[PDB]
Amino acid sequence: MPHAFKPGDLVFAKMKGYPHWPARIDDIADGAVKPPPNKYPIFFFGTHETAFLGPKDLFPYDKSKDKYGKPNKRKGFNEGLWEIQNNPHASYS
Template sequence: MGRKGKKYVKQFNVGDFVFAKVRGFRAWPARILRKEVRKMYHVYFYGTCNIAKVGIPQLFEYEKNKVRLGDVQKRANSSFRSAMDHVQKSVSNPGQDQGYFQAKAELTSEDQELESDTKSSTDSSTSSSLELDGKKLTKFNLPFIHITGDSD
């Protein structure tokens, strides 16, 4: 028989330190940049300075799992060691984490560009054209290319 009752759902806030697991890679020290809809988070990975979208089941609290997932002795990878050093410095001084704040600024600037693009496309919703460098591009301006060996 299984347990009865509600399943515990992890809650994370922007700026929380976590270990994030991406398919094909080990759990890596990270920090939450932004919460997305549908239980997804954008995270900033220490050491590699990459950004990825990760689901809640692949996130683990940093302090609770530091001994299990952050053991540098078991993991001889030098990039993992540098990532652990970077996250430990950031945990001690979270306000001076330059890489995290730079990634957060880039992510918000990309969102603002996308919003401005969608606003301009909704303003001209009557036509199916897009403007690029002062030139109007129609929605379907690519020529038809027949693929040889196609059954049609």
């Protein structure tokens, strides 16, 4: 059965106005800004942006890839597909 989301989990993450996007749940570095309560830090592959999102916007990658893991016109999306599939745990700083 499902656990709660943890750092390192891979997802497609949904933001208003964008397609479901390949992403991971990030760690918070020592000394770094924490997310609001109930939110997770989401690192979006390809764009390398971070936003804070709740579970309602988080779709487990294995379950969802057949639906959402298709090329898209948007900036950074296809790069993001490569990253999530080929090196999802790398440092992208």
